[PDB]
Write a protein that binds this ligand. Structure first.
Ligand SMILES: [Cl-]
Length: 249
């Protein structure tokens, strides 16, 4: 292809491509409650978010490397001119062993103790906002106006791949935010459906104190036990989050 070069345009675009992007958020996702499933979901998010940040750092390095390439091209056009005169996957938090049933009071105490998903929601807000930030940070990968030919085209192909990488990272930012929101919603659902500590207390106290009530109260206690088991089983299932494994830049 017939070559056109604007050396200054190349140098400008080098500066532009490596200009800082906003840093990802650092909110720590805290477990919504004391259940092992809730703790495991929050740990899985910590690990996924850490790896996302490490991959985002590697992306910044790649933008620096592309800037250097462009500056080396700019220089080489000047030379000919003169002469003519460690990234890995995210660990999976093991969820095996989580109890699907428990003493009632213990299960209710664990569900009721903790921030109930406030931290998870804040985590999701930051990563959602980062998704939109990244989407706004791709003009730097556009084509050239006055650099044409094979080198320009090769550069444009690299720029295109970095654009696609950023947008894939934006999608994963949104996906990981959705995981946190999903576990927060799961937790609110579990509170709606699991018997409360105090409801369980009241029933057990009446049972203990009133022998003639026991035969007729027991089915209420059994319904509570059974509903508790269903809720804990579903919490264990649904809180198991897939690790986020970003693409290498
Ligand atoms: Cl537990």
């Amino acid at each position: 292809a017939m070559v056109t070069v604007d050396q200054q345009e190349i140098l400008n675009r080098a500066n532009e491509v490596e200009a800082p992007m906003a840093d990802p958020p650092t909110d720590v996702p805290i477990t919504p409650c004391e259940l092992t499933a809730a703790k495991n979901a929050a740990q899985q998010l910590v690990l996924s978010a850490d790896n996302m940040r490490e991959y985002l750092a590697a992306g910044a390095k790649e933008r620096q490397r592309l800037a250097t390439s462009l500056r080396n091209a700019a220089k080489a056009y000047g030379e000919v001119d003169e002469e003519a005169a460690e990234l890995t996957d995210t660990p999976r938090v093991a969820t095996a062993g989580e109890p699907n049933f428990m003493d009632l009071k213990e299960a209710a105490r664990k569900l009721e103790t903790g921030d109930q998903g406030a931290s998870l929601a804040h985590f999701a807000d930051g990563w959602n906002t980062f998704n939109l930030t990244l989407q706004g940070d791709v003009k730097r990968f556009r084509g050239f106006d006055n650099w044409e030919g094979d080198a320009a085209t090769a550069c444009e192909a690299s720029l295109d791949q970095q654009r696609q990488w950023i947008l894939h990272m934006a999608k994963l930012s949104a996906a990981m935010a959705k995981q946190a929101q999903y576990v927060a919603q799961l937790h609110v659902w579990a509170r709606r459906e699991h018997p409360t500590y105090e409801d369980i207390v009241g029933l057990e106290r009446l049972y203990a104190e009133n022998p003639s009530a026991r035969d007729q109260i027991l089915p209420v206690y059994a319904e509570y036990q059974q509903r508790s088991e269903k809720v804990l089983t579903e919490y264990n299932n649904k809180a198991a989050l897939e690790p986020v494994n970003p693409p290498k830049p």
